[model samples]
Target chain A: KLPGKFLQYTVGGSDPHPGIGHEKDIRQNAVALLDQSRRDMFHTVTPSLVFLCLLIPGLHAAFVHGGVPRESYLSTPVTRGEQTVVKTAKFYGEKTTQRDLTELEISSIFSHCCSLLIGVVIGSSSKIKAGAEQIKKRFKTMMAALNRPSHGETATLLQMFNPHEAIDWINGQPWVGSFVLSLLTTDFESPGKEFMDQIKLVASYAQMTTYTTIKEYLAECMDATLTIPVVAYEIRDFLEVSAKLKEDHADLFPFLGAIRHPDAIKLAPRSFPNLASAAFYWSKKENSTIQPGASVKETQLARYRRREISRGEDGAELSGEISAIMKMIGVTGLN
Target chain B: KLPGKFLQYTVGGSDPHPGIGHEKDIRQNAVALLDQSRRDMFHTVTPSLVFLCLLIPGLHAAFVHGGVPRESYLSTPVTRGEQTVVKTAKFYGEKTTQRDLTELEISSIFSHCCSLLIGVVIGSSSKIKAGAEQIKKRFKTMMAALNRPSHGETATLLQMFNPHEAIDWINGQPWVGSFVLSLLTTDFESPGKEFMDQIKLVASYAQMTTYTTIKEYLAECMDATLTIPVVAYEIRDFLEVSAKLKEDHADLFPFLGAIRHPDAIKLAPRSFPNLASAAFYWSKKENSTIQPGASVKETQLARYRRREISRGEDGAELSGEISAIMKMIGVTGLN
Candidate 1:
């Protein structure tokens, strides 16, 4: 004897969800795959090794103090376009004249930038993965790259300009003035009335520099801590997942199976072979090639035994041919 | 033009040994190992997808912009120590300091930070080979830890002061004077000198200002282009490899084999199921467990249905378990 039940009927329906659950499922699946991938990617980044390399006896002084000048990192390079822009600075106003650059120029300008970027990336990743050994290995590689002469030039040249200074210079560029002003105008403190009021009356201004220094300072410390980690966390996740793959599957122990997996085996059929329909097999089988070919001298001996090839004073090329023969005979799987 | 041979000297000296050929060989072997490891590690990171989540909408915004007010990131809610710090700051500093943060104080710190660190380490690996991603992830993780709320009332609080501001407010800090001196000492003519000098001073002066606005700008421009890629690349590399594993290998792939043959099926042993034993078997066998995982879940399902744990929710955990399983599986090569 419920009173009319609502009193009639209550329409109970799920909160209208249109495709959210599906989207979440897709996202979860994608995230899982990405998570696995991140773990695996850490394999390549041996941050400890890299750090040790950085801390190594001569390396620290070489890179930090003298190897790559701090100035190089401070200064952004002057590309052809930048040079032209600077030239026109007199007309447009020194701060407003910075011009656009081409793709090639952008690439060239940012070429050496990659090394410092690489250093930061690896250093952070190593710490996250706890793969100290791998980190050292990566560090050594970075050090080697850093030790190069051209690399030094780029780093040093760019280091010459601090980002804060660059920003100020950018603000001063005549072309950017309107944009900068517009940008400033839209901000919470437009015209900076509280502070700029006093300075506005100064046509004979002793100091009209914006509170740029404060912003730059905040930007730097924050940028270093904030930005670097964002990148590192991302990389570590990738490496972790990458490292987990082979353990999950075993039939295709080697070959593309580790990454390209079963589909790869099916797709390339030739590289992966079974007994009845065997298209490709490891060269290391009973009479396969890797054994002799593993050693150039051994291959030479085999050829000499068969009178197919001979050792000579200039046998380097013959050695190469034998190596090629070995490659064809037993070295299966992706190169 | 052959020089006269000193035949009397050679027969007595075993094989004209170059004095250190064995040593050289050992060095060469070591170098080869290092080089191969370096290459393997790098390639693994090239297409990592660990941080693929970061590329997605929600997580990206969270990493770059989410967090507590004034604080770009908020660690776990306050503990007693943090509460005291907040109380002290409220009494001494700006009104923005929470007078009774204890009201909203949650549990202990670092749990969230640790999880975040772990997430980043794994998430970024799916991006690419660039080592930068790792650092990007780590930096963020570490920053989260350092910025944890428990440090104290005086650790970092924002205050606005001019160049001639009183030193009393900064009395407890030891390095401020030296930092300021260094800032004023740097040569302004150098490119970044102006910027670097400005930052040092800014760091000394701006203690408690909210960093999000500029941080947002940085994330949009500099961090995204420079620092973020490091994590992205690592994640990219990790993901690609994992995807490759699923596409290539089936579920039964062992852990050790993947680590060992990372790039190729390099070795063989009679007692172990080397690539030689399984390559042919895997090639011809119908869909089975010895394949890798996949990036494309549906496709993976179609290729091998039963063993598609690679497509399962627990795949990541399963992937981690395989390394331990390898020792247990006790594989042996067939004659």
Candidate 2:
């Protein structure tokens, strides 16, 4: 009745979805994980956050390869990339023992995790090709799994695989165009009309490349006779579900809306530790050497100090929530 | 003993001018011509005005050449450039019939005329090359004549031939730099940093060329051991004489001070029949064919009409002085 190829889910209406009538434990667990992730805001952009989201999708290869590459995930010499992922999983893994999670919880966690992963991919460093490549390979695995069943990985991947939604999220961001241009071109003496035209050219190239790659992958899945409708229908469902979560849980997941929304989390200032600098940290961790002038950490510290100063002579209590959230998410080096 | 190569004039006391004080009549006439030109601001910039100043020191070629080349100088087929000069001379020539002029009056007239001619050269068009060439040739002739006696052409040419003053006048104008650039370069689509730099380069070229030309000429005149002073004396003399004329009779020649001054007497709007277009008219007379888009006469008429409209229904009484001034200068075609 919604006029699309995808089977629709109706809680009580005429439409029926094959995957909806699952066990209570599964649905309960899925909702719980999503709700937990919703409330976690302060550490929204930490590397651990990336992995916590990655764990449910069964994408162990992203952590195993170029990320942290260690046994104890949370310990020091916790390199920039791979260590954060394993640490986040173990962190939530301990919480799991306090109360076992059901199939639905696992599925919901993966759905939320995949979206976070996608955000990082779009917003992450363009410096190291390897991180992006590994993610691409893992996504291919998830797409392959989508053919199998209505539970676990298949259901989660279906929610996150809407290419139209991903592209639309990207298109909505005006800053992304300028960001891509700044990344591609060096500063010019006379930044006049022609220079602006070239910036437009490169940004459009990035959009088209992303659009083509996703569309082609989706066509192959359709040819293989996957259960989902046209890619647009999946995109529509994905947005609807995302909207429902935000509407019902705005207070908990204030940061979980449009990818390019002003409130979207950015790990570092666009300039100093931009995607390129972030890649350097990812590649070498403690061994990484940032260029002389490119320390984003300095700016972050200055901002924190300013906030403290604005609060008063004694400001620790005022910023307590932020500190506690940072600790919970495994970030260190603050006062 | 006023500290220069040229002999100084002294009205009395310690200061001595080489050429002054021989005749009270000469200084009187010089001051009077300057005064009349000053108060005659209605026709502030007219061909007659240029010639009124030119009548001193005997620079006949400027008046005699193409301008006012016939009898009853202001009469028609009175031509664009040539008719104006002779007509202006005849206009003042008859004004002199009311009373005899002194040697100084005749001398001041030519000095003023040369300045006006030089003004025209600097302010004139870049289009026609000939008017500038002719003025250059006449100045050279006047320079050669300076080797003669103190009475006739020599003293007058010497008064008018201060290169340092001319150069300084040109240098003081801020708009001259841009004007020079416009003269040199065509309109460009991408006017970048490099384009502006090139403009500066060319303008500097003009300055240096004028400097070298004037300086060399001054050196040649003083070559046979002209006396002590590094050229500062000539500049001093030029200004003192100019000041004397302005101070003694501010009521007469107020427009003579600055070339680009707000009060600078621009005869026709620069965009209209500007100095250059005027020069073209002078050189070619009735035969002159202005560039299609560069017709300044149309602009002058439009201004006259606008002024007429602003003056009310019957505006002739309001604009009578200007119309008379225009007629005196031999500018035809006004109702």
Candidate-wise lDDT, in order:
0.24, 0.31
Q: Candidate 2: how large is its RMSD?
A: 40.1
Computed on C-alphas against the true complex, the DockQ of each candidate is: 0.01, 0.00
RMSD in Å for all candidates: 32.8, 40.1
The residue ranges of model 2 lying beyond 4 angstroms of the native Cα positions read A1-42, A46-58, A69-100, A117-206, A209-335, B1-335
- What are the models' TM-scores? 0.16, 0.16
* Candidate closest to the true structure, highest DockQ: 1
Across B1-335, the per-residue lDDT of candidate 1 in tens digits comes to: 88987666445441110011121122222122122222232211110111111111122222223221111111222357545211110111122322211110111111122222222222222222234333233323333333422211111111010111112211212433332333233343322232233233223212211121122222222112212333244334434644565466543122212122232131121111222122222223321312232122323323332331111121112232332222122211110
Tens digits of lDDT, candidate 2, A1-335: 11111111112211100111112223232333344342232122222233242342322332233232222222222357664332332222234534555555444444444443343334422212123444333433443454323443444422422222222222223333332323233343432222223323323323222222322332322111111112223333333544565576463232222223332222122222222232332233212223334433322221221111011133435366776787888875355
